[PDB]
Amino acid sequence: GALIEHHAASSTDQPVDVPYNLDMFSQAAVLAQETYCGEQAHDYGLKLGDATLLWTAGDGNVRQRVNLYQSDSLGIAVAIQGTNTSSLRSDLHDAQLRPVDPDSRYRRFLPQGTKVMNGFQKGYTDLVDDIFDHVKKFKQEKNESRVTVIGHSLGAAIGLLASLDINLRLEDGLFKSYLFGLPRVGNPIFANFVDRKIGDKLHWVVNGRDWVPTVPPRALGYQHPSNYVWIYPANSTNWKLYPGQENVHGMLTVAREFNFDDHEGIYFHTQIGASLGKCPAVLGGY
Amino acid sequence: LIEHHAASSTDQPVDVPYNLDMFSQAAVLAQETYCGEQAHDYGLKLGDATLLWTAGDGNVRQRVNLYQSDSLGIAVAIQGTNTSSLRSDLHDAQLRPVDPDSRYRRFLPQGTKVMNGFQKGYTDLVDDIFDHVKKFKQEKNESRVTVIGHSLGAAIGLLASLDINLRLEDGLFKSYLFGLPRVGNPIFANFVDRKIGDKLHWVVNGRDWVPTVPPRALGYQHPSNYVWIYPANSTNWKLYPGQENVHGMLTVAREFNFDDHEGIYFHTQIGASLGKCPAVLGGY
Ligand SMILES: *[C@@H]1O[C@H](CO)[C@@H](O[C@@H]2O[C@H](CO)[C@@H](O)[C@H](O)[C@H]2NC(C)=O)[C@H](O)[C@H]1NC(C)=O
Ligand SMILES: *[C@@H]1O[C@H](CO)[C@@H](O[C@@H]2O[C@H](CO)[C@@H](O)[C@H](O)[C@H]2NC(C)=O)[C@H](O)[C@H]1NC(C)=O
Ligand SMILES: *[C@@H]1O[C@H](CO)[C@@H](O)[C@H](O)[C@H]1NC(C)=O
Ligand SMILES: *[C@@H]1O[C@H](CO)[C@@H](O)[C@H](O)[C@H]1NC(C)=O
Helix, strand or coil, rough: CCCCCCCCCCCCCCCCCCCCHHHHHHHHHHHHHHEEEECCCCCCCCCCCCCCEEECCCCCCCCCEEEEEEECCEEEEEEECCHHHHHHHHHHCHHHHHECEEEEEEEEEECCCCCEEHHHHHHHHHCCHHHHHHHHHHHHHHHCCCEEEEEEHHHHHHHHHHHHHHHHHCCCCCCEEEEEECCECHHHHHHHHHHHHHHHCCEEEEEECCCCHHCCCCCCCCCCCCCCEEEECCCCCCEEEEECCCCCCCCHHHHEEEEECCCCCEECCCCCCCCCCCCCCCCCCC | CCCCCCCCCCCCEECCCHHHHHHHHHHHHHHHHCCCCCCCCCCCEEECEEEEEECCCCCCCCCEEEECCCCCCEEEECCCCCCHHHHHHHEEEHHCCCCCCCHHHHHHHHHHHHHEHHHHHCCCCCHHHHHHHHHHHEEEEEEEEEEEEEHHCCCCCCCHHEEEEEEECCCCCEEEEEECCCCEEEEHHHHHHHHHHCCCEEEEEEEEHHHCCHHHHHHEEECCCCCEEEECCCCCEECCCCCCCCCCCCHHCCCCCCCCCCCEECCCCEHHHHHCCCCCCCCC
């Protein structure tokens, strides 16, 4: 249709050592994986690391599966199910890709001109009311003010929206966010806002030459938030943090030499992937 | 989405190995394409180059000026445009990747695609260019043919350079392109490198937007080895090897402007609202 002529930042900052607690990142990883376990979905009481399963909705068909835990280190942890690269390759076309206004439940908290990808926001708005209801319920039952949002893949995209929304609309806001294989979600206005409001809480990681964080493309006006960890090579222990947005020393340096395999793999010693991790999911070991 | 891959070279930039006298000589001819009153001043001389023939008027077809040049031979310079015009017209059907025109399609790999708007710009002129290149090569006893262009003219120029090299006896001597937009897909870009890579010289000025469009996300890929003048209009220039070099233009990903398209390229001014008419070689 038309070329996006808006500018956007591409950071030139040098990559730094990853400063985060990787036990917590790993704990998030095993929960991200458990979202792909259908038979264990309503196994309430199941414990994965420090996190005990309390509630689940969705099934990966009409709505993404969401699993909610009490976790010693993460508080009330909400993990959202992702998908695989062949589903994303099939589904990301046409109306899905449209940059749209924020849903009315949270539109008034975000800058004017904020846009997010239609299919990702839809994935979120189909779950948001049940997530909010059950977060509030279990925060009250467990006397827990901390809320962590976690997700891989489509789950990471839904997760970014949930993390920002929870931080703006729910009392106590967000504690942490942990996102794995994150697609682009919104425009530069969105990305700057994410940085401003949840930048100090947000943790996200890209595995090697994963295609997923290259889409939707910058040419459609989409922009990542700041500071991703890049695991390179994929599945290795070689990780660094790439400051600012769309860092030129990172992903950008291979973004037309992607593959469809690195999306699933080993993230900080834990397997994540619909075809890869086990059920129930195992923490660490790789 | 375009799920096809494409190369993005990681090779370090190197010094520019080119004869810059010839690149500047091209630059004054790229500018003269913008001079409408002088379009038919046959005999006019700019550097080592004498005007022999002109077609087009910038309205229905781009202006093309044809010279005899001591250093470049029969030189064909194609008029470009300004960033404002490109911002307005690069939409919808103009951006579409299309098959090569039947005149040259069988010479190009299967799967080659070029931007529809730029190919139309060329195919509106190609027959007149071919006829007159042949006419003046024979009249001047000249086997060297050089193609030159800025802006849209650089895009039309790239197609001409390849087409001439494949279809015309003696092929191409040199190509000099300034502020080159993307023109075709990776198959095109690879083929350009294979067939005219050792003849091709092209340069981007600073944070010029034009060489960022059309986007890679629509399937477009630059050929190898651009000179980058950075900052814009300065004498700091390096060559960026391979295609879509990650150390170059891509490092100012999305922080373009609409002003560097016109400016100082190897000491000579190029741009529709910036030169003199007649154009001046060097001085800046
Ligand atoms: C990182 O780990 C993943 C998961 O083991 C690897 O994915 C496999 O890659 C091969 C080809 O590269 C495919 O044929 C398999 O189907 C993939 N498995 C899955 C479950 O996707 C990936 O290749 C690894 N990447 C690197 C760079 O080692
Ligand atoms: C390089 O040269 C060109 C010479 O025109 C500069 O373009 C001008 O820039 C100013 C400030 O942005 C604009 O207001 C003018 O309209 C531009 N002129 C034209 C004809 O486009 C360009 O800014 C210079 N760039 C650098 C980095 O020095
Ligand atoms: C990917 O996920 C889809 C949708 O759930 C499923 O039908 C398919 O079996 C999966 N593909 C692979 C290769 O595992
Ligand atoms: C750009 O070029 C076109 C020629 O079609 C002209 O009409 C327009 O006024 C020019 N714009 C500027 C800013 O020089």
